[PDB]
Amino acid sequence: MSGFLEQRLGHCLRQMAEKGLEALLVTHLTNSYYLTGFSGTAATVLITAKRRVLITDSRYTLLAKASVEGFDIIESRTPLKVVAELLEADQIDCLGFEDQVSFSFYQAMQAELSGITLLAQSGFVEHLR
Amino acid sequence: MSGFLEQRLGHCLRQMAEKGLEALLVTHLTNSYYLTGFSGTAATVLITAKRRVLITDSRYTLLAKASVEGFDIIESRTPLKVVAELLEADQIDCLGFEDQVSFSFYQAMQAELSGITLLAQSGFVEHLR
Amino acid sequence: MSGFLEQRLGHCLRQMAEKGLEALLVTHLTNSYYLTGFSGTAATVLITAKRRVLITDSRYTLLAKASVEGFDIIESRTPLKVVAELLEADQIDCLGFEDQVSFSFYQAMQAELSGITLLAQSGFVEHLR
Amino acid sequence: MSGFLEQRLGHCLRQMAEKGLEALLVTHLTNSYYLTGFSGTAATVLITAKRRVLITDSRYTLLAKASVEGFDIIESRTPLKVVAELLEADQIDCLGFEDQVSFSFYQAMQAELSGITLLAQSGFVEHLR
């Protein structure tokens, strides 16, 4: 009798723990919806053992805050700088991300995450369902 | 239209020469279509000052050789392997590609194109219109 | 069967993104059935990164709504008009279609889809298998 | 003494590339020192064509980050889980390792690195002098 939505996140975290993956960036819409229940076309989700963060822009901050339970909501138009700050604050040196991101988005990640070992994941959230 | 396509190619080549780009890999349909008139999504195009190559699979080989002017048509299910062989043949060690490829596709590129520096472009062909 | 259906669709979507195909129109039974499990010939399927739609007529609306998971069902006897509205809404100006459509159906697309580039594919859905 | 370090690492990578060795695990202080200039005995080094990683614990993280050039530094007390994630992310199937590791270390590696073909090396780093 656990929630369908919470259970999806528990399963994500258990997968991460089994793998030793300390942090997972989720950018693709069907995957972030899968984990958060949020619709909005702009959403960057960072999950660690300790943090569950939903970063969105202006258009959607109110909506998120009034609907998404169990994620800290952060308004920002440079979501990758926010990610970099969290990994630095939490002393995390590795970041999982989706291999389906565009190369341009990968360059933006390397620009902001210097020092962080980036680990492309193939179908990570896909393989949860 | 035949003329219209040769002019677009000529434009592409002039911009490449202006900027010192020796070789360009086009793998997104709107841009391969722009340069070749070929509508099929199995199209890996390689352009250099010398080469105009369209790599496709057996579903399309016959039609591409009948319908695409001024491109050499190569049939392959592993077009990045053919790309490596052409670059070796011409002694080109640097390749421009489209920044909208996925990170997954970039890793396959690195797998097949050892020794080649891969340089991502934003909207290189788009910018020709 | 929805497990397998969901992976097929996921594969279709990743192939389209890799090749840069923004929208795909599926109008032949074997392929709409493969992707939706819907067996009726009255089935015009439109797939984009953001949208999955199955247009059918009133013979089939109730069943389609009950049985087709993850596709929006739209009842219309003029599917191409619905297609034009959706592509306008999402600001999509290229559309892949199956090369097995009749020439008369391609002319109907040209009439209804003004300003959209129509790109014929050979066996796109078939090649997912 | 960055001069010699860059040359040694250069040599290491050329030797790997000649044998076809895609990844090398260095876990003996003499050899990680020769390659990186790092001092503590908590270091697990992973070298590939694309990745240079030094994994150590939080007693050493500040130091390594301040004084090891051209390796990314990962703080972790489960270095074999990190190795597993790196090989998964990079699609590497084979890992060379030093044949002076203990049998129990080998057992732990074999059990963690499921699916990975392990390749004992005899004096790989020592032979670079």
Interface A–C counts its CB contacts (< 8 A) at 6
Instruction: State the Cα–Cα distance between residues B20 and D129, nearest whole angstrom.
Output: 40
Residue type, D19: K
Method: X-ray
How far apart are the CA of C78 and the nearest CA of chain A, in angstroms? 30
Q: Is the pair A, D in contact (3+ CB pairs within 8 Å)?
A: yes
Residue type, D64: A
Instruction: State the Cα–Cα distance between residues D49 and B58, nearest whole angstrom.
Output: 34
Tokens of residue C52, six digits: 């999955």
For chain D, how big is the Rg over CA atoms in Å? 14
DSSP D116: P
Q: Which CATH architecture has domain C2-129?
A: 3-Layer(aba) Sandwich (3.40)
Instruction: State the Cα–Cα distance between residues D58 and D62, nearest whole angstrom.
Output: 8
Full strand arrangement of the beta sheet holding A44-48: A72-75, A52-56, A44-48, A23-26, A94-98, A117-121
Chain A residues closer than 8 Å to B120 by CB:
103-104, 107
* Partner-chain residue, chosen from C20, C123, C127, that has the shortest CB–CB distance to B29: C20
| CB A25, CB A83: distance < 8 Å | yes
Beta strands at B94-98 and B23-26: parallel, antiparallel or unpaired = parallel
Instruction: State the Cα–Cα distance between residues C18 and C14, nearest whole angstrom.
Output: 6
Q: Which residue of C has its CA nearest to B44?
A: C19
Resolution (A): 2.0
Measured between alpha carbons, how far apart are the two ends of chain B, in Å?
Answer: 15
**Cα D34–chain centre separation:** 12
Residues whose CB falls within 8 Å of the CB of residue D68, separated by 6 or more in sequence, listed in order: D36, D37, D38, D54
Residues whose CB falls within 8 Å of the CB of residue A45, separated by 6 or more in sequence, listed in order: A25, A26, A27, A32, A35, A36, A52, A53, A54, A55, A71
Tokens of residue A62, six digits: 């109110």
Phi, psi of C8 (to 5 degrees): -60, -50
Residue type, B93: D
Instruction: State the Cα–Cα distance between residues B111 and B114, nearest whole angstrom.
Output: 7
Instruction: State the Cα–Cα distance between residues D13 and D52, nearest whole angstrom.
Output: 10
HSE toward the beta carbon, residue B42, CA cutoff 13 A: 23
The domain locations on chain D are 2-129
The answer to whether B111 contacts D90, with C-beta atoms less than 8 Å apart, is no
Chain C residues closer than 8 Å to B100 by CB:
20
Residues whose CB falls within 8 Å of the CB of residue D14, separated by 6 or more in sequence, listed in order: none
